Amino acid sequence: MKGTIVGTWIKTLRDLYGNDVVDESLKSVGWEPDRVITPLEDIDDDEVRRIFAKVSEKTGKNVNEIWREVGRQNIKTFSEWFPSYFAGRRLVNFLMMMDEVHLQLTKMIKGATPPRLIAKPVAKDAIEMEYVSKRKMYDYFLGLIEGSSKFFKEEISVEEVERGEKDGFSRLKVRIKFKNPVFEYKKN
Ligand code: HEM
Ligand SMILES: [Xe]
Ligand SMILES: [Xe]
Protein backbone atom coordinates (compact mmCIF):
# COMPACT_ATOMS: atom_id res chain seq x y z
CA MET A 1 0.00 0.00 0.00
CA LYS A 2 1.28 3.46 -0.72
CA GLY A 3 2.74 5.04 2.39
CA THR A 4 0.77 8.28 2.12
CA ILE A 5 -2.52 6.45 2.36
CA VAL A 6 -1.49 4.11 5.17
CA GLY A 7 -0.65 7.28 7.07
CA THR A 8 -4.18 8.51 6.60
CA TRP A 9 -5.49 5.19 7.94
CA ILE A 10 -3.51 5.59 11.20
CA LYS A 11 -4.97 9.02 11.88
CA THR A 12 -8.43 7.80 10.90
CA LEU A 13 -8.08 4.80 13.23
CA ARG A 14 -7.17 7.25 16.07
CA ASP A 15 -10.18 9.43 15.23
CA LEU A 16 -12.46 6.40 15.34
CA TYR A 17 -11.13 4.18 18.14
CA GLY A 18 -8.61 6.20 20.17
CA ASN A 19 -4.87 6.45 20.71
CA ASP A 20 -4.47 3.42 23.05
CA VAL A 21 -6.07 1.01 20.55
CA VAL A 22 -3.93 2.40 17.77
CA ASP A 23 -0.56 2.63 19.61
CA GLU A 24 -0.97 -0.96 20.85
CA SER A 25 -1.94 -2.22 17.40
CA LEU A 26 1.11 -0.60 15.80
CA LYS A 27 3.36 -1.83 18.62
CA SER A 28 2.00 -5.30 17.91
CA VAL A 29 3.51 -5.42 14.39
CA GLY A 30 6.66 -3.87 15.85
CA TRP A 31 6.18 -0.27 14.64
CA GLU A 32 7.01 2.80 16.66
CA PRO A 33 3.63 3.73 18.20
CA ASP A 34 4.26 7.24 16.85
CA ARG A 35 5.65 6.23 13.43
CA VAL A 36 5.11 8.82 10.69
CA ILE A 37 4.92 7.22 7.24
CA THR A 38 6.56 9.30 4.53
CA PRO A 39 5.78 9.44 0.83
CA LEU A 40 9.15 7.72 0.39
CA GLU A 41 7.68 4.53 1.81
CA ASP A 42 5.38 1.78 0.85
CA ILE A 43 3.76 -0.50 3.43
CA ASP A 44 3.29 -4.25 3.05
CA ASP A 45 -0.45 -5.05 2.71
CA ASP A 46 -0.21 -7.88 5.20
CA GLU A 47 1.30 -5.65 7.95
CA VAL A 48 -1.72 -3.43 7.46
CA ARG A 49 -4.00 -6.45 7.73
CA ARG A 50 -2.32 -7.50 11.00
CA ILE A 51 -2.77 -3.95 12.32
CA PHE A 52 -6.46 -4.04 11.49
CA ALA A 53 -6.74 -7.53 13.03
CA LYS A 54 -5.40 -6.10 16.29
CA VAL A 55 -7.87 -3.21 16.09
CA SER A 56 -10.69 -5.75 15.63
CA GLU A 57 -9.49 -7.83 18.62
CA LYS A 58 -9.26 -4.73 20.88
CA THR A 59 -12.53 -3.04 19.86
CA GLY A 60 -14.59 -6.22 19.55
CA LYS A 61 -15.77 -5.20 16.01
CA ASN A 62 -15.39 -7.53 13.02
CA VAL A 63 -12.56 -6.41 10.71
CA ASN A 64 -14.97 -5.70 7.80
CA GLU A 65 -16.99 -3.32 9.92
CA ILE A 66 -13.73 -1.58 10.83
CA TRP A 67 -12.83 -1.22 7.13
CA ARG A 68 -16.33 0.10 6.37
CA GLU A 69 -16.03 2.63 9.21
CA VAL A 70 -12.51 3.57 8.18
CA GLY A 71 -13.67 4.08 4.56
CA ARG A 72 -16.41 6.47 5.76
CA GLN A 73 -14.16 8.49 8.08
CA ASN A 74 -11.11 8.47 5.80
CA ILE A 75 -12.88 10.80 3.32
CA LYS A 76 -12.77 13.52 6.03
CA THR A 77 -9.09 12.73 6.64
CA PHE A 78 -8.37 13.00 2.86
CA SER A 79 -10.30 16.32 2.75
CA GLU A 80 -8.01 17.72 5.48
CA TRP A 81 -4.66 16.38 4.22
CA PHE A 82 -5.21 16.52 0.39
CA PRO A 83 -7.87 19.22 0.07
CA SER A 84 -7.12 19.97 -3.57
CA TYR A 85 -8.92 16.76 -4.62
CA PHE A 86 -12.13 18.25 -3.11
CA ALA A 87 -11.85 22.00 -3.87
CA GLY A 88 -14.81 23.13 -5.96
CA ARG A 89 -16.08 19.72 -6.96
CA ARG A 90 -19.47 18.03 -6.72
CA LEU A 91 -19.89 14.37 -5.70
CA VAL A 92 -20.42 13.08 -9.21
CA ASN A 93 -17.17 14.68 -10.56
CA PHE A 94 -15.19 13.56 -7.59
CA LEU A 95 -16.35 9.95 -8.11
CA MET A 96 -15.75 9.88 -11.86
CA MET A 97 -12.16 11.12 -11.53
CA MET A 98 -11.12 8.51 -8.91
CA ASP A 99 -9.91 5.91 -11.38
CA GLU A 100 -7.55 8.43 -12.94
CA VAL A 101 -6.42 9.84 -9.60
CA HIS A 102 -5.50 6.34 -8.43
CA LEU A 103 -3.32 5.74 -11.56
CA GLN A 104 -1.72 9.19 -11.29
CA LEU A 105 -0.81 8.73 -7.60
CA THR A 106 0.85 5.36 -8.11
CA LYS A 107 2.49 5.82 -11.53
CA MET A 108 5.82 6.69 -9.87
CA ILE A 109 5.81 3.34 -8.07
CA LYS A 110 7.57 0.34 -9.61
CA GLY A 111 5.06 -2.39 -10.36
CA ALA A 112 2.12 -0.41 -8.92
CA THR A 113 -1.19 -2.21 -8.42
CA PRO A 114 -3.74 0.54 -7.78
CA PRO A 115 -7.43 -0.46 -7.47
CA ARG A 116 -9.34 0.36 -10.68
CA LEU A 117 -12.49 2.34 -10.02
CA ILE A 118 -13.95 2.96 -13.51
CA ALA A 119 -17.26 4.85 -13.44
CA LYS A 120 -19.74 5.35 -16.31
CA PRO A 121 -23.13 7.12 -16.57
CA VAL A 122 -26.00 4.66 -17.02
CA ALA A 123 -28.90 7.06 -16.62
CA LYS A 124 -29.64 10.77 -16.26
CA ASP A 125 -29.26 10.41 -12.46
CA ALA A 126 -27.01 7.39 -11.97
CA ILE A 127 -23.61 5.97 -12.56
CA GLU A 128 -22.14 2.53 -12.36
CA MET A 129 -18.79 2.15 -10.66
CA GLU A 130 -16.76 -1.02 -10.58
CA TYR A 131 -14.05 -1.66 -8.03
CA VAL A 132 -11.43 -4.07 -9.34
CA SER A 133 -8.39 -5.02 -7.30
CA LYS A 134 -6.43 -8.04 -6.10
CA ARG A 135 -6.78 -6.67 -2.56
CA LYS A 136 -10.44 -7.51 -1.96
CA MET A 137 -11.16 -4.33 0.07
CA TYR A 138 -14.93 -4.30 -0.55
CA ASP A 139 -15.97 -2.62 2.76
CA TYR A 140 -13.32 0.08 2.50
CA PHE A 141 -14.54 0.89 -1.07
CA LEU A 142 -18.23 1.03 0.05
CA GLY A 143 -17.36 3.05 3.15
CA LEU A 144 -15.42 5.61 1.02
CA ILE A 145 -18.50 6.08 -1.21
CA GLU A 146 -20.66 6.54 1.87
CA GLY A 147 -18.13 9.01 3.32
CA SER A 148 -18.01 10.89 -0.01
CA SER A 149 -21.80 11.36 0.03
CA LYS A 150 -21.56 12.65 3.62
CA PHE A 151 -18.72 15.10 2.87
CA PHE A 152 -20.30 16.59 -0.24
CA LYS A 153 -23.69 16.63 1.50
CA GLU A 154 -25.28 14.90 -1.51
CA GLU A 155 -27.63 12.04 -0.84
CA ILE A 156 -27.26 8.90 -2.89
CA SER A 157 -28.74 5.42 -3.07
CA VAL A 158 -26.09 2.69 -3.59
CA GLU A 159 -27.08 -0.66 -5.15
CA GLU A 160 -24.52 -3.49 -5.00
CA VAL A 161 -25.16 -5.22 -8.32
CA GLU A 162 -22.44 -7.88 -8.03
CA ARG A 163 -19.37 -8.93 -6.06
CA GLY A 164 -16.89 -11.75 -6.66
CA GLU A 165 -13.53 -12.85 -8.05
CA LYS A 166 -12.75 -13.04 -11.75
CA ASP A 167 -9.39 -13.87 -13.30
CA GLY A 168 -7.65 -13.35 -9.94
CA PHE A 169 -9.19 -9.90 -9.34
CA SER A 170 -11.87 -9.09 -6.78
CA ARG A 171 -14.61 -7.01 -8.32
CA LEU A 172 -17.53 -5.07 -6.87
CA LYS A 173 -19.96 -3.24 -9.17
CA VAL A 174 -22.33 -0.69 -7.72
CA ARG A 175 -25.06 1.48 -9.23
CA ILE A 176 -25.06 4.92 -7.58
CA LYS A 177 -28.25 6.99 -7.90
CA PHE A 178 -28.22 10.75 -7.17
CA LYS A 179 -31.27 12.74 -6.05
CA ASN A 180 -31.27 14.81 -9.27
CA PRO A 181 -30.26 14.62 -12.92
CA VAL A 182 -26.51 14.90 -13.36
CA PHE A 183 -26.03 13.70 -16.98
CA GLU A 184 -27.68 14.46 -20.29
CA TYR A 185 -27.47 12.90 -23.71
CA LYS A 186 -24.96 14.62 -25.99
CA LYS A 187 -23.66 13.93 -29.51
CA ASN A 188 -20.86 11.36 -29.23
C1 HEM B 1 -8.74 12.35 -2.40
C2 HEM B 1 -9.30 11.15 -2.49
C3 HEM B 1 -8.44 9.88 -2.65
C4 HEM B 1 -7.11 9.73 -2.81
C5 HEM B 1 -6.00 10.80 -2.84
C6 HEM B 1 -6.83 8.31 -2.88
C7 HEM B 1 -5.60 7.73 -3.09
C8 HEM B 1 -5.34 6.37 -2.91
C9 HEM B 1 -4.08 5.73 -3.06
C10 HEM B 1 -2.75 6.38 -3.50
C11 HEM B 1 -4.23 4.43 -2.76
C12 HEM B 1 -3.08 3.38 -2.76
C13 HEM B 1 -3.13 2.44 -3.96
C14 HEM B 1 -1.94 1.47 -3.99
O1 HEM B 1 -0.98 1.57 -3.16
O2 HEM B 1 -1.95 0.55 -4.86
C15 HEM B 1 -5.63 4.21 -2.44
C16 HEM B 1 -6.24 3.01 -2.05
C17 HEM B 1 -7.58 2.73 -2.25
N1 HEM B 1 -8.51 3.62 -2.80
FE1 HEM B 1 -8.30 5.65 -2.73
N2 HEM B 1 -8.04 7.63 -2.77
C18 HEM B 1 -9.06 8.57 -2.67
C19 HEM B 1 -10.41 8.35 -2.56
C20 HEM B 1 -10.97 7.13 -2.89
C21 HEM B 1 -12.36 6.85 -3.25
C22 HEM B 1 -13.52 7.85 -3.29
C23 HEM B 1 -12.44 5.54 -3.47
C24 HEM B 1 -13.69 4.74 -3.87
C25 HEM B 1 -14.62 5.38 -4.55
C26 HEM B 1 -11.16 4.95 -3.31
C27 HEM B 1 -10.91 3.60 -3.39
C28 HEM B 1 -9.78 3.04 -2.86
C29 HEM B 1 -9.67 1.65 -2.38
C30 HEM B 1 -10.82 0.63 -2.30
C31 HEM B 1 -8.22 1.45 -1.95
C32 HEM B 1 -7.52 0.19 -1.30
C33 HEM B 1 -6.51 -0.42 -2.31
C34 HEM B 1 -7.22 -1.57 -3.02
O3 HEM B 1 -8.46 -1.77 -2.83
O4 HEM B 1 -6.54 -2.26 -3.83
N3 HEM B 1 -10.27 5.93 -2.95
N4 HEM B 1 -6.28 5.41 -2.61
XE1 LIG C 1 -2.55 1.26 9.45
XE1 LIG D 1 -4.65 -3.97 3.15
XYZ file of C-alpha atoms and ligand atoms in Angstrom:
233
model
C 0.000 0.000 0.000
C 1.282 3.460 -0.724
C 2.737 5.044 2.392
C 0.767 8.282 2.117
C -2.520 6.455 2.360
C -1.491 4.105 5.172
C -0.646 7.284 7.074
C -4.181 8.509 6.604
C -5.492 5.193 7.944
C -3.514 5.592 11.196
C -4.969 9.024 11.884
C -8.431 7.804 10.901
C -8.083 4.799 13.233
C -7.172 7.249 16.072
C -10.177 9.428 15.233
C -12.462 6.396 15.343
C -11.129 4.185 18.142
C -8.607 6.198 20.167
C -4.870 6.448 20.714
C -4.474 3.423 23.046
C -6.071 1.008 20.554
C -3.928 2.398 17.765
C -0.564 2.631 19.614
C -0.974 -0.963 20.848
C -1.937 -2.216 17.399
C 1.108 -0.597 15.803
C 3.361 -1.826 18.621
C 2.002 -5.296 17.909
C 3.511 -5.416 14.387
C 6.661 -3.873 15.848
C 6.181 -0.272 14.642
C 7.010 2.801 16.660
C 3.625 3.734 18.200
C 4.263 7.236 16.849
C 5.648 6.227 13.425
C 5.106 8.819 10.689
C 4.917 7.222 7.244
C 6.562 9.300 4.525
C 5.777 9.444 0.827
C 9.151 7.724 0.392
C 7.685 4.530 1.814
C 5.382 1.780 0.854
C 3.757 -0.496 3.425
C 3.288 -4.249 3.051
C -0.454 -5.049 2.706
C -0.211 -7.879 5.202
C 1.298 -5.649 7.947
C -1.723 -3.432 7.464
C -4.000 -6.448 7.732
C -2.322 -7.500 11.003
C -2.773 -3.947 12.316
C -6.456 -4.037 11.494
C -6.744 -7.529 13.035
C -5.400 -6.105 16.291
C -7.867 -3.213 16.086
C -10.695 -5.754 15.634
C -9.486 -7.827 18.617
C -9.264 -4.732 20.880
C -12.525 -3.039 19.864
C -14.589 -6.223 19.547
C -15.770 -5.199 16.008
C -15.391 -7.527 13.023
C -12.557 -6.407 10.706
C -14.971 -5.696 7.800
C -16.995 -3.315 9.921
C -13.726 -1.584 10.831
C -12.832 -1.216 7.126
C -16.328 0.095 6.370
C -16.027 2.632 9.212
C -12.508 3.574 8.181
C -13.674 4.085 4.565
C -16.415 6.475 5.755
C -14.158 8.492 8.079
C -11.112 8.466 5.802
C -12.881 10.803 3.322
C -12.773 13.515 6.035
C -9.085 12.734 6.644
C -8.374 13.000 2.859
C -10.298 16.317 2.752
C -8.010 17.717 5.483
C -4.661 16.384 4.224
C -5.212 16.516 0.388
C -7.865 19.221 0.073
C -7.121 19.974 -3.567
C -8.920 16.764 -4.618
C -12.132 18.252 -3.109
C -11.854 22.004 -3.870
C -14.809 23.130 -5.961
C -16.085 19.719 -6.961
C -19.467 18.028 -6.722
C -19.891 14.373 -5.705
C -20.418 13.083 -9.207
C -17.174 14.684 -10.564
C -15.188 13.564 -7.586
C -16.351 9.946 -8.108
C -15.749 9.885 -11.861
C -12.160 11.118 -11.527
C -11.124 8.513 -8.906
C -9.911 5.905 -11.384
C -7.546 8.431 -12.944
C -6.416 9.842 -9.605
C -5.503 6.335 -8.431
C -3.322 5.742 -11.559
C -1.716 9.189 -11.295
C -0.810 8.734 -7.603
C 0.848 5.362 -8.112
C 2.494 5.820 -11.530
C 5.820 6.686 -9.869
C 5.814 3.342 -8.067
C 7.572 0.337 -9.606
C 5.064 -2.387 -10.360
C 2.122 -0.413 -8.917
C -1.194 -2.214 -8.416
C -3.741 0.542 -7.777
C -7.432 -0.464 -7.473
C -9.335 0.365 -10.682
C -12.492 2.340 -10.018
C -13.948 2.962 -13.510
C -17.255 4.850 -13.444
C -19.740 5.353 -16.309
C -23.134 7.120 -16.571
C -26.005 4.657 -17.018
C -28.902 7.065 -16.618
C -29.638 10.767 -16.263
C -29.257 10.409 -12.464
C -27.015 7.387 -11.966
C -23.607 5.966 -12.558
C -22.138 2.528 -12.359
C -18.790 2.151 -10.657
C -16.761 -1.025 -10.576
C -14.050 -1.656 -8.025
C -11.435 -4.072 -9.340
C -8.387 -5.018 -7.305
C -6.433 -8.037 -6.100
C -6.779 -6.668 -2.558
C -10.440 -7.515 -1.957
C -11.155 -4.334 0.067
C -14.925 -4.295 -0.546
C -15.965 -2.618 2.764
C -13.320 0.076 2.503
C -14.539 0.887 -1.072
C -18.229 1.026 0.051
C -17.357 3.052 3.151
C -15.423 5.606 1.025
C -18.502 6.084 -1.206
C -20.658 6.539 1.874
C -18.133 9.005 3.316
C -18.011 10.892 -0.009
C -21.804 11.362 0.030
C -21.561 12.652 3.619
C -18.717 15.095 2.867
C -20.302 16.592 -0.238
C -23.693 16.627 1.501
C -25.282 14.897 -1.510
C -27.627 12.038 -0.840
C -27.262 8.902 -2.894
C -28.745 5.423 -3.068
C -26.091 2.691 -3.589
C -27.083 -0.656 -5.150
C -24.525 -3.489 -5.003
C -25.165 -5.225 -8.318
C -22.438 -7.876 -8.026
C -19.371 -8.932 -6.059
C -16.889 -11.747 -6.661
C -13.533 -12.846 -8.054
C -12.749 -13.043 -11.749
C -9.395 -13.874 -13.304
C -7.647 -13.350 -9.941
C -9.195 -9.899 -9.341
C -11.869 -9.089 -6.780
C -14.615 -7.010 -8.322
C -17.525 -5.074 -6.868
C -19.956 -3.241 -9.170
C -22.331 -0.686 -7.716
C -25.060 1.482 -9.227
C -25.057 4.924 -7.582
C -28.253 6.989 -7.895
C -28.218 10.746 -7.171
C -31.268 12.736 -6.046
C -31.268 14.805 -9.271
C -30.260 14.618 -12.921
C -26.513 14.897 -13.363
C -26.026 13.698 -16.976
C -27.675 14.458 -20.293
C -27.470 12.905 -23.712
C -24.964 14.623 -25.985
C -23.662 13.934 -29.508
C -20.859 11.358 -29.229
C -8.739 12.351 -2.401
C -9.304 11.150 -2.493
C -8.442 9.878 -2.646
C -7.108 9.728 -2.810
C -6.001 10.797 -2.836
C -6.834 8.305 -2.881
C -5.603 7.729 -3.089
C -5.339 6.374 -2.915
C -4.081 5.726 -3.058
C -2.754 6.384 -3.496
C -4.228 4.430 -2.755
C -3.076 3.384 -2.762
C -3.133 2.435 -3.961
C -1.938 1.466 -3.991
O -0.976 1.566 -3.157
O -1.951 0.550 -4.862
C -5.633 4.208 -2.435
C -6.242 3.014 -2.045
C -7.582 2.729 -2.254
N -8.513 3.623 -2.799
Fe -8.297 5.646 -2.726
N -8.039 7.635 -2.766
C -9.057 8.572 -2.672
C -10.406 8.349 -2.557
C -10.969 7.128 -2.887
C -12.359 6.848 -3.246
C -13.524 7.848 -3.289
C -12.444 5.539 -3.468
C -13.693 4.742 -3.866
C -14.618 5.383 -4.554
C -11.162 4.954 -3.311
C -10.909 3.603 -3.389
C -9.775 3.037 -2.858
C -9.668 1.652 -2.381
C -10.823 0.634 -2.302
C -8.223 1.454 -1.946
C -7.521 0.195 -1.304
C -6.512 -0.419 -2.308
C -7.223 -1.566 -3.019
O -8.455 -1.765 -2.833
O -6.544 -2.264 -3.828
N -10.269 5.934 -2.946
N -6.275 5.411 -2.606
Xe -2.546 1.258 9.447
Xe -4.648 -3.973 3.153
